[PDB]
């Protein structure tokens, strides 16, 4: 019963950052050495936890959040960050305990005509709370006049698409991101290391 990190990291299709995907890890042994012994990651930033020191540790639950952004925005998947992604798409708490794993996916998420399936939220009337997921497509009212679900003057559709073409420079090519988060409650633990 090894934990299904494979069906999260090698999922053929990922998800847009505004509708980020969460996988609940439960009732399994997690061999995190497969993660940090891999030579195919660009970034492996862990916060408040040591990935090399938890294969003899147990947790009540582990969450695997996966989505796609661009290289300029990978630095925003971290506690205490601001920007389009951190404020309107995916926010991490200041006391975040987990890892942010990212790798370039230009060979997978780019098309010659430009990949326009991956979206991100451009406007929102307020910042996201940590681990909040907004999928609404309501028209953003930027001015005094109120829109009636119609797009127009000072009335924007809230989702814009990434322009992932294979010829984009580093930072505008897509990156797939997996965010592992760990919680420990006063409840039984189901995710342990092999030790």
């Amino acid at each position, epitope marked *: 019963n090894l934990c299904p990190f494979g069906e999260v990291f090698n999922a053929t299709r990922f998800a847009s950052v505004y509708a980020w995907n969460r996988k609940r890890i439960s009732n399994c042994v997690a061999d995190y*050495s497969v993660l*940090y*012994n891999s030579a195919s*990651f*660009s*970034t*492996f*930033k*862990c*916060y*408040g*936890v*040591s*990935p*090399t*020191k938890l294969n003899d540790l147990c947790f009540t639950n582990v969450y695997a959040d996966s989505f796609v952004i661009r290289g300029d925005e*990978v*630095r925003q998947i971290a506690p205490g960050q601001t920007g389009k992604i951190a404020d309107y798409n995916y926010k991490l*708490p200041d*006391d*975040f*305990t987990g*890892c942010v794993i990212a790798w370039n996916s230009n060979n997978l998420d780019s098309k010659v005509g430009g990949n326009y399936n991956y979206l991100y939220r451009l406007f929102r009337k307020s910042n996201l709370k940590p681990f909040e997921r907004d999928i609404s497509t309501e028209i953003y009212q930027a001015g005094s006049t109120p829109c009636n679900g119609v797009e127009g003057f000072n009335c924007y559709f809230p989702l814009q698409s990434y322009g992932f073409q294979p010829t984009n420079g580093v930072g505008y090519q897509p990156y797939r991101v997996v965010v592992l*988060s*760990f*919680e*420990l409650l006063h409840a039984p633990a189901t995710v342990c290391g092999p030790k």
Partner: antibody
Amino acid sequence: TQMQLVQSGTEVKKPGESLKISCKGSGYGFITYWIGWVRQMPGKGLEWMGIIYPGDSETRYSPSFQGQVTISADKSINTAYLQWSSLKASDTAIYYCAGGSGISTPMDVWGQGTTVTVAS
Amino acid sequence: DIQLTQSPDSLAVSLGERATINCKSSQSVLYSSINKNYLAWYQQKPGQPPKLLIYWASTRESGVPDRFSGSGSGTDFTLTISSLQAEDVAVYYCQQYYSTPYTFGQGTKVEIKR
């Protein structure tokens, strides 16, 4: 061992000269490690200078060392650097590099230190 | 910015007795997600790099004798060397790794009481 940090040799420099000391991590899983620099003046305690994540070169400094030193890294050779542009006599100390997989994690691996001497 | 103050600065304890070192933080270091305090204890000897003894306030690092134990919560933490031995004579620092900048205590010297 999960990680070992080897450090450059002892340095005898003159006041005003520049200096760059290194700290190379030897082991697998270095992608997850953050390397910090600790200064220990002769007969004094431990001062945390800064830390750097070599994967993207995110660098945080202590307010006592902000702008006084430059902590760089070369992720292609698992090496982190600590350099001065103009050495003062008050820079004579031993400099330990310390590593730990993750940030806000204990520094659980240390090098044997690099002793720097800025002196006629 | 978190500041740590150790006490006492010097400590003399007879062979086989209990040595206790206190560490006070100007701010809490408790992560709510995993109920753990982000406080560590280090030992240093002359000509040697610091050795990690205890992390998460009360968890023993590998290669540390059973007689080393940590405790505390909030802002008061304690390193306890029960049955003090000869090679335990060293300087002991408490470090917080709750947030950057990392900070150390001023150091506590522990000697055998002849």
